[PDB]
Amino acid sequence: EAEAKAKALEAQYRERERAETEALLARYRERAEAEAKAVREKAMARLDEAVALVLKEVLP
Amino acid sequence: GELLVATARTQARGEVLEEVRRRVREALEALPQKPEWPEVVRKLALEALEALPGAKALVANPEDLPHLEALARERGVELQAEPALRLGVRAVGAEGKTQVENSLLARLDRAWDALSSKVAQALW
Amino acid sequence: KKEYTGITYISGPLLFVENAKDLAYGAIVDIKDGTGRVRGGQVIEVSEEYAVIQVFEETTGLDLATTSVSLVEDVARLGVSKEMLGRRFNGIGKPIDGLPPITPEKRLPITGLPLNPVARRKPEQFIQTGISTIDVMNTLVRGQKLPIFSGSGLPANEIAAQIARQATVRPDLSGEGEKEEPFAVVFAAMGITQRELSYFIQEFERTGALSRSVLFLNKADDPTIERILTPRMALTVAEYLAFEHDYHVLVILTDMTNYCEALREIGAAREEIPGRRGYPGYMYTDLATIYERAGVVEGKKGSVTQIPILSMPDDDRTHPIPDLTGYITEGQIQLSRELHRKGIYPPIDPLPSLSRLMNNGVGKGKTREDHKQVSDQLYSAYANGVDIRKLVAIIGEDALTENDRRYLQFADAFERFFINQGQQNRSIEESLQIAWALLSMLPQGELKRISKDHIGKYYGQK
Amino acid sequence: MIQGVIQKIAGPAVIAKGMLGARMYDICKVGEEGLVGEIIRLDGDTAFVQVYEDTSGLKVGEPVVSTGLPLAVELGPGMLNGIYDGIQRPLERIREKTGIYITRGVVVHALDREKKWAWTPMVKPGDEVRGGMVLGTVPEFGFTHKILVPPDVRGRVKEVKPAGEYTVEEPVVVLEDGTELKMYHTWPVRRARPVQRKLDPNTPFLTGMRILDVLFPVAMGGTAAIPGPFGSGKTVTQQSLAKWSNADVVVYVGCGERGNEMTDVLVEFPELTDPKTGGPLMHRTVLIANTSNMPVAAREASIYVGVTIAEYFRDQGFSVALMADSTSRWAEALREISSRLEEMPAEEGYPPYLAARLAAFYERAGKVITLGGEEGAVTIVGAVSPPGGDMSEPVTQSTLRIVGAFWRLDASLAFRRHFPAINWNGSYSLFTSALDPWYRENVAEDYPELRDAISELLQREAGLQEIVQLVGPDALQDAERLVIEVGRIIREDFLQQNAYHEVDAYCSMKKAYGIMKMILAFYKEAEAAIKRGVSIDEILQLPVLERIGRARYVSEEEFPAYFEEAMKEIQGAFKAL
Ligand SMILES: Nc1ncnc2c1ncn2[C@@H]1O[C@H](COP(=O)(O)OP(=O)(O)O)[C@@H](O)[C@H]1O
Ligand SMILES: [Mg+2]
């Protein structure tokens, strides 16, 4: 009885941690994708004047 | 998960800097047919002289052989025309065994790490 | 942007460059072959007539007609930033992890400076390293540089990876200062098999303990001068982080024997006389240069702990490499063939292995107040367990006293419950707990190194 | 191309002047006889050509013509069932041309030309082949020998000649350019064939020796260094590895080792049978031979040619072993032509860059996934001959830091004929950890347990040898004289193997599992029966362990039923004491 209840709680908590890992997993995929968008959006609004800065350093 | 988040952040950081470097490269490679480049070439030409005193020869793009003729005879040096050296000049000094090179592409490849730290500061 | 063409005399790893005098001594050069390939060289012996360049890589395609050199970074430096803590580097400083390169805050010279001997304090706290027979019997204090004298075929790289992903400070064991220090592992492997390089990439990125570390790796087939420059790189990155951003930092220098072989085979390139037993005479100074750049600092809130792991050459302690290492460092810990292949991991053995600074790193509010006495007691008990286990072959089990058979059972079970750790993240309280469970098999009263306060408090419980 | 004249001759070193502008490592043609040579150390006008044949009768003024190419092998179909020398010249062709001596100055091709191979095409026209995509197949003695795109060649295939009988010159696949792709292609010996991605060692190299497969294993992408004094069974061991192991092809690189132990290899491999399929064993060995009186600069070329032919057969999805005996003869060739550069040498006399060379050679091993997508693996077994018979040299203690699987021989085990003379006390293998999955899913489930028990019994024996030679094998306790006698019977049964017996030459690992299970069943129940209290004379005269002492001579067919009955008698002869 004791070893049966042991492996029953073992399998149930396997599957519980599997759901935990998959939930935080998909959360952090969406998190990294949203942050990649959140930075490459910020890329565009300061492009040409920074290029003028580097062009003024390179051609001094 | 936090380490993958940091990987995505540094990846985005690097590709925005790749965008910046690429558009600087395109502005550089679009310079020599816009109405400034015979004012561009003289500065780096005389500075290729002054970075190696005692030159004998210069060689650069033959599209502005006039601006390398009548503004470098006072520089007192051979001028020989060989293309394939885009945006600049190179100076062969004395005894034929030294060659200072000078190009805006070369200056970008020498200055881009320092300007990358500076652009990342003034950009983020 | 300034080629010095006109070179003469290539010879093995040395090419000479004519008519060059702006080449700073110890500069780095791009050697460009005439077919568009770039190599590295270090400038040595720059004179009026010429300047010698020791080429980094092989010399195959070079010639005299079309071969140019040019200067980059005239004294050796690296670009350091705070955001290099998820990265690998190739000895020079270029990544091999595929991520786009860092935005360098500072630009530091990879040759360091000696600390000012008034400007440091003594090391006084401790660190846990997961290994029980390090945490209890020869403690790693923050500032110590203790080397792991491996063998040849013993696991040293596995203990490297284990200490790398299991070291943690314990400020809760202190009088509860802040957690404002994070921890940082600077891991510098020089001269590795590349099988071990696959082992280090997977054993760092596996558990997600790469995110507080930085791996300066280079293979064996990579050129020898990167195996020179690698511990300079790692100690100057760690010195930057620990004295500019207040991190307790642990620096793991893998395989110092590969370093000293590369130092011999780069000393013999530029034609200086090898001194004792083939090694250069300045090996003591050059090796102390990369040991004595660790340690705490007065006033600042950092500490640089340093573990040089080194193979013994022909497993003796009279060779120049472990002789000078034990003649510079702070004690040693030592693996053993005997434990390893009667089957034990990690195979540290606590008889010949000591730490100098343990008496300053344990005690009142450091880790636990009974620590040093249990250290001495475990040492003497395993000491007279080994030789009584060796004597019992020629007298017999049933022809001793009784406490001596208790010592024999203690030693035989000691070296498979205390040293046979396996891989569990063994804390300091758990390891002292199992140390008292092992001391319980000795009779009370026979523990003649501990006063009865800690005896009555802790002893008895298996 | 580039003309020069000889300024100086000394031995195999010819300083040739006037060669303003040749590169390093370009093969020269020295003298009017067309001697092969190699450029090092050029300073202005001169260049320093070492030569691959003995200069005698060469005189100054004679011309030197460079080529511009570095030392290039010609790779293709036609190297299996082959003997070459250090610059890939076929010795059957040299015997057909000359008599029984090797006259210098000969030009022969690295692959024969008139032999009509049998092209089967693979790719349809119009495809965009990358460097390393396959092109077609050729049956080459039971191996479906592929024909690669050479590395660093990209394009679109226009034409493909059909499934016919062709020759190795004839261009079968022309790209869109006119860049055509014939069967053979040259490749420089100093660049590893650039591979896609290098996998990890997780699969054994089944040797056939028992100790070299049970106590000290070699994985698939592994390296293995076998050093030993003279007269210690190196070359019989390496012929056993070439003869019985599970590799697809075997590259035997004779480098400084004597003539007769490649003569007999040419004489007795054509009668043998491959253990993998039914082909004759000489149809899977490439055999590069540089004997000692063949000239003393070619040794470097012979080892680099053997390892790059092995890398070519790695790219074709095969699985290669490379047995390079006497790497220290290549160290001596580097010392000898580093004695005419008059440079300052390192420790012992050797040049400084010797560890750089040994690293750059032992790091072409490793199981890889190649350019074609299919995976392959070169394993390398390198022998080391120390000068004094002392593993404290700059050869051995530069090569023991970059290898796993170090098999240190000794002379004392080979003075009496206890072969192979593996000194167990100082050998190791770093592939015991990361191979136990394969051992579990292919030999037996309890194989690590049994193996580690064998290891700790041998360690406990070699810990008690101290006491037993300081006091004597009498006046002991009887519970450890069983340890010493089980160590004695494991050294007389499990480790000791004669290669020339018809059986026990080869020993697959279920037989070794059977013998170890017999020995440890005996030791477990014997220490049980001695804690019951018996003699130890009464153990060492049982009729149950002459069975054990003969239990390596049964074949791999009788060994199951023989194993069941020996196991039965060991389980049944201890209750009767
Ligand atoms: N596996 C073996 N079984 C029995 N005898 C062996 C074995 N290996 C070597 N020997 C004996 O030792 C000799 C060693 O030959 P060889 O390997 O050429 O010497 P070296 O070890 O110096 O190369 C052989 O001729 C043979 O008589
Ligand atoms: Mg031999």
Side-chain angles (χ1 to χ4, degrees):
Chain A
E1 191 269 332
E3 59 91 22
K5 186 181 287 183
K7 64 177 70 174
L9 196 278
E10 192 272 334
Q12 183 176 1
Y13 198 61
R14 284 177 183 172
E15 295 180 354
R16 185 176 179 179
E17 192 270 331
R18 182 65 62 194
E20 291 290 329
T21 300
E22 185 176 0
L24 272 299
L25 192 279
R27 178 179 176 85
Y28 287 162
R29 269 97 172 98
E30 187 177 2
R31 181 76 270 172
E33 184 176 0
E35 290 178 353
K37 183 179 72 66
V39 176
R40 288 183 181 90
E41 180 184 2
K42 188 258 183 64
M44 189 179 290
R46 290 180 179 178
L47 193 147
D48 290 330
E49 55 269 21
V51 169
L53 175 63
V54 182
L55 189 65
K56 191 175 179 180
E57 202 280 334
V58 168
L59 182 62
Chain B
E2 296 294 329
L3 185 54
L4 180 60
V5 168
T7 301
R9 291 178 66 188
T10 307
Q11 180 64 258
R13 177 63 53 90
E15 287 183 354
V16 177
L17 281 176
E18 197 272 329
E19 171 67 28
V20 171
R21 188 178 179 180
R22 184 192 61 85
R23 183 64 65 192
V24 172
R25 287 176 67 189
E26 291 180 354
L28 286 169
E29 72 191 3
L31 290 176
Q33 288 179 356
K34 293 180 183 178
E36 63 271 11
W37 61 284
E39 194 270 331
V40 170
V41 295
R42 59 97 181 266
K43 182 178 174 67
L44 47 85
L46 187 143
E47 190 62 32
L49 270 83
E50 293 293 326
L52 183 63
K56 67 175 74 172
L58 268 67
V59 49
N61 192 1
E63 291 181 352
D64 55 354
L65 283 175
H67 194 283
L68 274 71
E69 186 71 28
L71 281 78
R73 296 275 69 76
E74 76 275 21
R75 275 74 170 271
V77 69
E78 285 185 354
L79 273 301
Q80 65 182 358
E82 287 183 354
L85 196 147
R86 193 184 182 183
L87 272 76
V89 72
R90 68 177 178 88
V92 177
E95 71 264 8
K97 291 186 180 299
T98 297
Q99 45 185 357
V100 182
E101 190 176 2
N102 196 353
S103 178
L104 294 174
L105 299 174
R107 289 174 63 89
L108 177 62
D109 283 328
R110 293 290 169 93
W112 177 247
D113 53 358
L115 288 176
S116 70
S117 67
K118 192 261 186 294
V119 163
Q121 183 58 255
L123 188 60
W124 289 270
Chain C
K1 66 183 288 294
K2 195 256 184 64
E3 295 182 354
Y4 293 99
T5 181
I7 60 103
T8 182
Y9 189 74
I10 302 100
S11 169
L14 294 169
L15 72 89
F16 292 176
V17 173
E18 292 287 326
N19 65 13
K21 291 190 291 183
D22 289 329
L23 291 175
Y25 173 66
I28 306 301
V29 293
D30 289 330
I31 295 168
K32 188 186 288 185
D33 194 359
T35 61
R37 188 175 184 269
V38 181
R39 295 178 180 89
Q42 188 176 2
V43 174
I44 55 173
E45 202 179 2
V46 45
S47 66
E48 288 181 354
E49 295 179 353
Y50 60 94
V52 185
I53 291 173
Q54 183 172 3
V55 183
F56 290 0
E57 304 177 357
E58 76 278 13
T59 62
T60 297
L62 298 174
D63 54 355
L64 299 167
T66 59
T67 293
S68 63
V69 304
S70 295
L71 186 144
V72 283
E73 194 180 8
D74 56 351
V75 59
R77 294 184 181 93
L78 78 94
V80 67
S81 178
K82 186 171 68 71
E83 53 185 357
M84 65 191 296
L85 290 178
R87 310 299 304 276
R88 289 177 285 159
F89 300 99
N90 57 0
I92 297 299
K94 293 179 180 179
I96 56 171
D97 58 356
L99 290 179
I102 56 173
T103 67
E105 284 187 353
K106 290 181 75 69
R107 186 74 173 173
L108 293 176
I110 69 168
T111 177
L113 292 174
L115 284 171
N116 199 2
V118 182
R120 69 179 71 189
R121 62 181 176 88
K122 63 169 71 176
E124 67 183 2
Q125 296 186 359
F126 85 112
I127 200 168
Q128 77 178 3
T129 56
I131 307 299
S132 176
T133 180
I134 292 174
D135 291 332
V136 176
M137 292 187 72
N138 39 12
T139 317
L140 182 58
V141 306
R142 284 177 276 178
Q144 193 176 1
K145 52 190 83 64
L146 58 85
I148 294 177
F149 288 166
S150 172
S152 177
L154 298 175
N157 300 315
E158 291 184 353
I159 294 169
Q162 183 172 0
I163 297 173
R165 63 177 168 83
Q166 288 182 357
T168 306
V169 298
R170 302 297 293 274
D172 296 329
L173 273 296
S174 68
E176 189 61 31
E178 293 183 355
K179 297 179 176 68
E180 63 90 17
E181 43 87 15
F183 191 72
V185 174
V186 178
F187 183 80
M190 62 195 79
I192 57 178
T193 316
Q194 190 278 129
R195 171 196 67 250
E196 299 166 356
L197 189 141
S198 70
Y199 183 78
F200 288 126
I201 272 89
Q202 270 93 32
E203 289 292 328
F204 272 87
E205 78 178 5
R206 184 177 178 179
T207 180
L210 188 273
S211 68
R212 57 177 175 86
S213 65
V214 41
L215 310 179
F216 288 96
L217 303 174
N218 51 352
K219 299 183 265 77
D221 59 354
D222 285 335
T224 58
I225 210 162
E226 297 177 355
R227 292 189 288 171
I228 285 297
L229 297 179
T230 300
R232 275 80 174 170
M233 296 284 172
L235 288 176
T236 192
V237 172
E239 198 173 3
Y240 170 72
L241 289 175
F243 297 148
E244 298 289 328
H245 300 296
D246 296 327
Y247 297 3
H248 290 281
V249 179
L250 174 64
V251 182
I252 298 167
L253 302 176
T254 295
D255 291 329
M256 296 300 294
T257 303
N258 288 324
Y259 173 70
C260 298
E261 295 288 328
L263 183 59
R264 180 175 68 191
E265 292 173 351
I266 285 178
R270 48 87 51 87
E271 297 179 356
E272 59 186 355
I273 294 171
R276 181 174 182 268
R277 295 176 68 182
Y279 294 98
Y282 60 94
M283 183 184 171
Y284 178 73
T285 292
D286 197 9
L287 200 64
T289 305
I290 69 172
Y291 284 160
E292 290 284 333
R293 286 177 63 188
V296 293
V297 167
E298 179 186 1
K300 305 294 185 70
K301 290 178 94 289
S303 63
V304 182
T305 308
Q306 195 172 7
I307 300 169
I309 291 170
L310 65 91
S311 301
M312 289 180 182
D314 195 359
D315 67 5
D316 55 350
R317 295 177 65 100
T318 62
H319 190 80
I321 311 167
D323 196 4
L324 294 171
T325 294
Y327 201 75
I328 296 167
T329 53
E330 303 292 329
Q332 75 273 13
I333 75 168
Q334 185 172 3
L335 311 176
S336 64
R337 268 83 170 185
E338 183 179 2
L339 277 72
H340 167 70
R341 64 187 181 177
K342 68 182 184 291
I344 282 168
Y345 178 74
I348 295 172
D349 54 349
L351 298 177
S353 298
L354 80 154
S355 177
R356 308 298 189 94
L357 277 300
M358 181 179 70
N359 295 322
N360 295 117
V362 299
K364 178 67 176 176
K366 291 185 184 294
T367 170
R368 185 180 287 176
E369 198 173 4
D370 60 344
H371 199 282
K372 176 178 65 69
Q373 301 167 1
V374 176
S375 176
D376 283 330
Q377 178 59 47
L378 281 173
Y379 181 69
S380 71
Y382 190 64
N384 62 3
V386 170
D387 52 357
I388 201 70
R389 188 185 61 190
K390 190 173 261 76
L391 167 134
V392 82
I394 61 170
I395 297 177
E397 178 68 23
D398 202 74
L400 294 174
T401 69
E402 190 66 32
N403 58 4
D404 296 333
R405 290 194 293 273
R406 292 182 184 90
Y407 281 116
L408 192 147
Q409 186 181 5
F410 171 76
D412 198 2
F414 174 76
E415 66 186 2
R416 71 179 181 271
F417 284 102
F418 192 77
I419 301 172
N420 189 359
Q421 180 172 359
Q423 287 177 355
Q424 60 267 16
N425 192 357
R426 181 168 287 170
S427 301
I428 187 66
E429 68 274 10
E430 178 175 356
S431 184
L432 280 170
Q433 179 180 0
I434 294 172
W436 283 102
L438 268 297
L439 286 173
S440 290
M441 288 181 282
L442 289 179
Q444 179 169 355
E446 187 65 31
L447 272 69
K448 290 183 262 74
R449 294 179 185 272
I450 303 170
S451 180
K452 272 78 177 175
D453 292 332
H454 302 102
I455 295 297
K457 179 64 178 68
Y458 291 107
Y459 173 81
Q461 183 64 40
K462 172 69 184 73
Chain D
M1 188 268 171
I2 289 170
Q3 294 288 317
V5 294
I6 290 173
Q7 182 175 357
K8 189 170 188 181
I9 297 171
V14 172
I15 300 171
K17 70 184 180 183
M19 294 176 68
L20 181 61
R23 299 181 296 174
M24 291 182 73
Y25 289 155
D26 286 336
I27 299 298
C28 280
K29 305 292 184 182
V30 172
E32 290 177 353
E33 293 181 354
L35 270 72
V36 188
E38 185 178 1
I39 295 171
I40 56 172
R41 188 182 281 180
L42 39 87
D43 45 350
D45 50 350
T46 68
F48 193 86
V49 178
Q50 64 178 355
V51 293
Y52 285 169
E53 288 86 2
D54 47 349
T55 58
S56 67
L58 268 70
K59 65 181 70 178
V60 295
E62 289 177 347
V64 171
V65 176
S66 176
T67 307
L69 276 74
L71 180 63
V73 293
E74 298 181 356
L75 296 169
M79 297 184 292
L80 300 182
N81 191 3
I83 169 166
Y84 302 108
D85 54 352
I87 50 173
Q88 199 182 5
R89 297 174 294 168
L91 292 183
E92 59 183 359
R93 184 64 56 194
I94 303 299
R95 191 184 175 184
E96 191 271 330
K97 186 175 260 76
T98 320
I100 59 172
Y101 295 101
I102 301 171
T103 297
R104 64 183 183 181
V106 60
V107 48
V108 290
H109 292 90
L111 280 75
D112 288 333
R113 296 291 189 266
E114 71 174 0
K115 183 179 184 293
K116 295 181 180 180
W117 297 97
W119 172 262
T120 296
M122 185 182 287
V123 293
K124 293 184 262 74
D127 293 334
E128 294 291 335
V129 294
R130 193 181 176 181
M133 182 176 176
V134 297
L135 293 171
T137 56
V138 168
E140 188 180 6
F141 304 106
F143 297 98
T144 305
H145 182 271
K146 303 177 185 180
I147 291 171
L148 302 175
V149 169
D152 304 334
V153 167
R154 297 177 293 173
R156 174 172 287 171
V157 44
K158 298 293 106 174
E159 64 179 1
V160 169
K161 292 186 180 178
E165 292 291 327
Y166 289 90
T167 186
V168 300
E169 293 178 353
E170 183 169 358
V172 295
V173 170
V174 180
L175 286 171
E176 194 273 331
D177 194 5
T179 302
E180 62 191 2
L181 301 173
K182 79 285 294 178
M183 289 183 181
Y184 73 100
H185 64 278
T186 65
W187 186 259
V189 298
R190 293 180 180 90
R191 295 184 64 249
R193 293 177 62 88
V195 80
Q196 182 182 2
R197 187 185 58 81
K198 296 186 73 174
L199 285 173
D200 53 348
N202 54 359
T203 292
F205 178 79
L206 299 182
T207 294
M209 294 292 179
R210 281 195 294 274
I211 178 169
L212 305 181
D213 285 331
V214 177
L215 296 179
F216 303 109
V218 174
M220 203 63 216
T223 57
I226 175 167
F230 68 101
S232 297
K234 286 183 260 73
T235 314
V236 176
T237 300
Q238 285 186 351
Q239 291 178 0
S240 171
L241 268 78
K243 194 181 292 181
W244 292 105
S245 66
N246 53 353
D248 291 330
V249 306
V250 168
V251 180
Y252 190 85
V253 184
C255 180
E257 289 289 327
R258 67 185 64 81
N260 281 314
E261 64 193 3
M262 303 184 81
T263 296
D264 60 355
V265 177
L266 291 177
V267 173
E268 78 191 3
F269 282 181
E271 73 178 3
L272 261 288
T273 301
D274 191 358
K276 294 179 78 71
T277 54
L281 182 57
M282 195 64 203
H283 290 100
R284 72 179 179 94
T285 59
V286 178
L287 194 145
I288 285 95
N290 190 4
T291 60
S292 292
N293 50 2
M294 293 172 75
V296 74
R299 296 175 183 178
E300 182 182 1
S302 67
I303 283 177
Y304 284 103
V305 165
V307 68
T308 190
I309 293 170
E311 188 166 359
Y312 175 65
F313 287 105
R314 188 184 68 187
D315 280 330
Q316 289 181 351
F318 287 168
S319 178
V320 186
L322 185 137
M323 303 177 190
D325 54 353
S326 291
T327 306
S328 66
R329 300 297 179 266
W330 167 49
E332 191 173 6
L334 294 174
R335 182 177 68 194
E336 180 172 354
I337 61 100
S338 175
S339 180
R340 296 184 183 274
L341 295 176
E342 62 95 28
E343 69 176 358
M344 186 174 176
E347 182 178 359
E348 195 71 25
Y350 290 103
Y353 52 88
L354 185 63
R357 297 295 181 86
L358 288 177
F361 165 70
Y362 280 89
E363 294 299 320
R364 300 185 188 185
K367 186 173 76 174
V368 301
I369 286 176
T370 63
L371 292 170
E374 185 67 30
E375 71 176 2
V378 169
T379 176
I380 287 170
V381 176
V384 175
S385 298
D390 48 351
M391 291 73 169
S392 300
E393 292 292 328
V395 183
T396 304
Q397 291 179 356
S398 169
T399 193
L400 65 88
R401 295 176 293 154
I402 62 174
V403 303
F406 181 76
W407 296 339
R408 183 171 180 176
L409 302 180
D410 53 353
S412 300
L413 293 175
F415 285 161
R416 68 182 183 273
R417 275 80 175 101
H418 180 270
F419 283 104
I422 302 290
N423 189 2
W424 182 74
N425 200 3
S427 297
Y428 64 93
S429 174
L430 298 180
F431 301 104
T432 57
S433 68
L435 266 71
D436 290 331
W438 188 83
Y439 283 145
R440 287 180 185 272
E441 287 110 18
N442 212 163
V443 177
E445 183 71 29
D446 63 346
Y447 190 79
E449 307 169 357
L450 193 69
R451 176 179 63 182
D452 293 329
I454 291 297
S455 177
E456 65 185 1
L457 262 70
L458 284 176
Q459 197 279 130
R460 191 174 301 124
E461 178 193 1
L464 295 181
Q465 288 296 323
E466 173 181 358
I467 297 172
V468 87
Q469 73 186 1
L470 191 145
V471 176
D474 296 333
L476 299 172
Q477 188 180 3
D478 292 331
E480 65 92 13
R481 197 179 297 119
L482 181 57
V483 176
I484 300 173
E485 294 294 329
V486 169
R488 191 263 306 162
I489 67 167
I490 189 171
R491 284 186 286 112
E492 289 186 355
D493 193 14
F494 179 73
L495 299 177
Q496 182 173 0
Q497 175 176 2
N498 48 358
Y500 301 100
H501 187 274
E502 296 182 354
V503 200
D504 196 71
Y506 181 75
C507 178
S508 65
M509 291 183 69
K510 283 190 181 294
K511 184 179 175 185
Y513 178 74
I515 299 170
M516 290 186 289
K517 188 176 178 180
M518 291 181 186
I519 292 168
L520 285 176
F522 181 79
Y523 179 69
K524 177 258 295 179
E525 293 182 358
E527 70 181 1
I530 203 167
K531 296 298 180 182
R532 188 182 72 194
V534 295
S535 300
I536 201 167
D537 194 0
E538 194 175 4
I539 290 171
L540 298 175
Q541 59 183 352
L542 295 179
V544 78
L545 56 85
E546 186 184 1
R547 187 76 56 84
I548 290 174
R550 302 293 180 184
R552 61 186 171 96
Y553 293 163
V554 290
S555 179
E556 287 179 351
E557 292 181 353
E558 189 179 0
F559 191 77
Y562 181 84
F563 175 64
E564 301 301 323
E565 296 298 319
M567 194 65 196
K568 179 178 180 179
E569 186 64 29
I570 291 171
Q571 291 167 352
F574 280 162
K575 62 183 175 68
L577 294 178

